[PDB]
Structures are given as C-alpha cells and as structure tokens.
DNA sequence: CTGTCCTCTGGCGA
DNA sequence: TCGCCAGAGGACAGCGAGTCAGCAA
RNA sequence: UGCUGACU
C-alpha cells in the first residue's frame, strides 16, 4: 500500500501543477488527504483527470497515467485517439520508468494539433515550485512583453534565457518565445523582478 | 541535414533565434521547398536586424550549430548515390594527405 | 526626459576637463577669474556659476540619445 | 597538474 | 546489426605582477 | 635573445 501513497502524492502534485497553469481546480483537490483520496479512488485508468481552463472553456487539458512502465509509440497513439475524438488539444503523460527514446520525438512531432508533454513519476513526488530557493514564475501576456521591450528599449534576443527543458519551464508549460517574469525574494532588495525569454 | 543547417544559418544571419527550433521542428514533422518558404518569410519579415545580430545568444547558437555539424556529419561514410564512393582521404602528420585506391 | 536630473560624477569630470582644455586654448572665460593660473580651477569656478554652454548627450544602450544642458542639470 | 574538450569505439535489441 | 549510453585514452593549454643587473651566445 | 643571480 505504498503504491497508493505514491499515487496520492502524484495526484496532489498534478492538481497543484494544473492550478498553477490556471485550470479550474477546487480547494478539496488541493487540500485532499490520503485517507479521503483512497476513500474516493485502485487502478491507473480512473486516476486520469480532465481539467478546464479559467477562460476558453473549450481549452481543457487531459492528464494520463499510462500502465506501461515504459510508454511507446503505440501507447501514445491509443490515447491521442481519445484526445482527437473527445476534441481536446493538450495532454500530460505521467510515465513510471521513462519513454522509449523514439517516443520523445513523436510527442514533439504531433503539431499544435495535439500538443502533448511527458512527466516522470519521480519528478512529481514533490512540488519543486515550493522550494525555498525557487522564485515565483509568471508567464507574461503578449501585451506585457511589448511594454517591457518598449520601456527598456530591448529586443527579444538580448534578454536572459531560460531553457525550454528547464524543470520550471516544463512545469509551467511555457512554450518557446514566451517571456516569464521572475520574482526573486532577495535578502538585499526584498522582491527583485527579472525576466527570461524561454528558449 | 544540409538544407536544415542552410536555412538555420540563413535565419541566424539576421538574428531570428526562434526560427532555428521552428525550422528544425518543421523538418522533423515533415524538403527544400518545405523549409525555404518559412526561412524566406522569416528573413523578409525580420530584416532590419542585421545590425542587431552581433549579440551573445546569437553567436552561441551559430557556434553550436557549426561545431555540431563539423563534429557529427563529416565522418567518412559509404556514399549515398554510388555505394562505393569512400575514396578514404586519411591524413598523416600535417603536409600529408593520402587517398587510397 | 526620462534620465536622472542630476549630473553624475563622470559627467562633471568630463565637462570640467573639456571646459579646461577650451580655456587653455585661449577661450573667453565668462567667470571673472581673480588671479588663478589653473584652467581647472577656472572651469570649477564656471561650473559653480552655472556658465557652461555644453550639451551632455547621454546615450542609451540602443543608440537613442537625450540632450541635456549643463545648466539644466542639478550639480551636487 | 589538472581540467575540459575531443575523438573515436566496439557492443545488445529494433 | 549498429545507435547511443557508456566507455577509454590522447591532446592542448593555462599556470601573479612589476623591477634591476651580469655574462654569453 | 636566453641563462644565472637579486628586490617587494
């Protein structure tokens, strides 16, 4: 019954990850304890969640928990079919051992039609975003980046870079070309604000 | 690889830095006509940036691209069009290059 | 119009240097010198009286510039 | 002297 | 059946400033 | 130009 503890931690972390992306999540899911998780729900196909977005109610996300410890191209297709038929665009695949290396470039191959993304199970046992040293990241909107570049007379290159595989760019699901504001809690100035272009 | 790198260089010359990964993904999802349309669209809509291309983060990308090319794609290989075109140049100490039969 | 109103120390140094190199090349002194042979003392005397017709052209990192008057600049 | 960088280098399932 | 994770050694290139002298090739 | 000494 440690499998259940792992399932509960991963589900709580994914609920927090979905709330930080701006999806409609209730307080109970974010404050759900183990005794009630196991009360509700055992399997790995009824842990799949489907969440809606604050705006764009059609824009929803779908979280998978594949059974195969090493997901492959066929496993990816089997529920890319589910997504294509239910009419969703985004997904999130929590894998237990990894993805066979061809799969990673397949997930990338699926054009903005159906954009997927993978997360290891050991990466979700804790919320890195809740570490002391990790600042708060905020994906800037297309109209705030323009005002930033205009205030500092900048170009989008010539800005600090954040890797597209950064453990906190993968969590906040930030695509390439997006600028993220970062609020460092500084011992010197309190709440220093920086900006990083995702690339 | 030849055409991908050609287009990536064409876009780097003007500074466009997202075009690099965009071209690579356009390729993998798919050759010259597929890539040259996007690359010309970039180089046209993003010109006026030949003076704003001599910045760090634009030199690192070109450095990495050309280094990876010279490091991974210039090894002796059986020839594509004629299967027996490995006239193995193999250079001894400087001032010496030896082709075989 | 958006940069600091005061005169940085580097600007004071360069303005004094240039005014002194001008005075030394036989330029008219608008400060009524009183027996001093140093052009740098004369340049300081002029800076204190707010008589220096020079235009500090502050350059921003993208080429854009702002032209300030040495008179319209708070000397600390 | 010590470090990275560099250049290979043959070895099991897809 | 060899591509990429692993795995090996080989090569290069750096090694604080600034002074004064003599002797000799 | 190099090798020997030498100074902080």
UniProtKB/Swiss-Prot annotation, chain A:
GO terms for cellular component: cytosol; nucleoplasm; nucleus; RNA polymerase I complex; RNA polymerase II, core complex; RNA polymerase III complex; RPAP3/R2TP/prefoldin-like complex. Its main location: nucleus. There is a cross-link at residue 70 (Glycyl lysine isopeptide (Lys-Gly) (interchain with G-Cter in SUMO2)). The lineage of its organism: Eukaryota, Metazoa, Chordata, Craniata, Vertebrata. This is DNA-directed RNA polymerases I, II, and III subunit RPABC1. One of its GO terms (molecular function) is DNA binding. Belongs to the archaeal Rpo5/eukaryotic RPB5 RNA polymerase subunit family. InterPro entries: Arch_Rpo5/euc_Rpb5, RNA_pol_Rpb5_N, RNA_pol_Rpb5_N_sf, RNA_pol_subH/Rpb5_C, RNA_pol_subH/Rpb5_CS, RPB5-like_sf. It is found in: Nucleus; Nucleus, Nucleolus. Keywords: Acetylation, DNA-directed RNA polymerase, Host-virus interaction, Isopeptide bond, Nucleus, Transcription, Ubl conjugation. Component of the RNA polymerase I (Pol I), RNA polymerase II (Pol II) and RNA polymerase III (Pol III) complexes consisting of at least 13, 12 and 17 subunits, respectively. Pol I complex consists of a ten-subunit catalytic core composed of POLR1A/RPA1, POLR1B/RPA2, POLR1C/RPAC1, POLR1D/RPAC2, POLR1H/RPA12, POLR2E/RPABC1, POLR2F/RPABC2, POLR2H/RPABC3, POLR2K/RPABC4 and POLR2L/RPABC5; a mobile stalk subunit POLR1F/RPA43 protruding from the core and additional subunits homologous to general transcription factors POLR1E/RPA49 and POLR1G/RPA34. (Microbial infection) Interacts with HBV protein X. GO terms for biological process: protein stabilization; transcription by RNA polymerase II; transcription elongation by RNA polymerase I; tRNA transcription by RNA polymerase III. HAMAP family: RNApol_Rpo5_RPB5.
From Swiss-Prot, chain B:
It is found in: Nucleus, Nucleolus; Chromosome. Residues 1-75 are annotated as: Clamp. It comes from the Eukaryota. Zn(2+) 2 binds at residues 79, 82. The clamps form the DNA-binding cleft. Component of the RNA polymerase I (Pol I) complex consisting of 13 subunits: a ten-subunit catalytic core composed of POLR1A/RPA1, POLR1B/RPA2, POLR1C/RPAC1, POLR1D/RPAC2, POLR1H/RPA12, POLR2E/RPABC1, POLR2F/RPABC2, POLR2H/RPABC3, POLR2K/RPABC4 and POLR2L/RPABC5; a mobile stalk subunit POLR1F/RPA43 protruding from the core and additional subunits homologous to general transcription factors POLR1E/RPA49 and POLR1G/RPA34. Part of Pol I pre-initiation complex (PIC), in which Pol I core assembles with RRN3 and promoter-bound UTBF and SL1/TIF-IB complex. Belongs to the RNA polymerase beta' chain family. It is linked to Acrofacial dysostosis, Cincinnati type: A form of acrofacial dysostosis, a group of disorders characterized by malformations of the craniofacial skeleton and, in some patients, the limbs. AFDCIN patients may also have structural cardiac defects and neurologic abnormalities including developmental delay, hypotonia, motor delay and seizures. AFDCIN inheritance is autosomal dominant. Catalytic core component of RNA polymerase I (Pol I), a DNA-dependent RNA polymerase which synthesizes ribosomal RNA precursors using the four ribonucleoside triphosphates as substrates. Transcribes 47S pre-rRNAs from multicopy rRNA gene clusters, giving rise to 5.8S, 18S and 28S ribosomal RNAs. Pol I-mediated transcription cycle proceeds through transcription initiation, transcription elongation and transcription termination stages. This is DNA-directed RNA polymerase I subunit RPA1. The gene is POLR1A.
From Swiss-Prot, chain C:
The gene is POLR2F. One of its GO terms (molecular function) is DNA binding. It comes from the Eukaryota. One of its GO terms (biological process) is transcription by RNA polymerase II. Keywords: Acetylation, DNA-directed RNA polymerase, Nucleus, Phosphoprotein, Transcription. The chain holds residues 51 to 126 of 127 of the full protein. DNA-dependent RNA polymerase catalyzes the transcription of DNA into RNA using the four ribonucleoside triphosphates as substrates. Common component of RNA polymerases I, II, and III which synthesize ribosomal RNA precursors, mRNA precursors and many functional non-coding RNAs, and small RNAs, such as 5S rRNA and tRNAs, respectively. Pol II is the central component of the basal RNA polymerase II transcription machinery. Pols are composed of mobile elements that move relative to each other. It is found in: Nucleus; Nucleus, Nucleolus. This is DNA-directed RNA polymerases I, II, and III subunit RPABC2. GO terms for cellular component: cytosol; fibrillar center; nucleoplasm; nucleus; RNA polymerase I complex; RNA polymerase II, core complex; RNA polymerase III complex. Belongs to the archaeal Rpo6/eukaryotic RPB6 RNA polymerase subunit family.
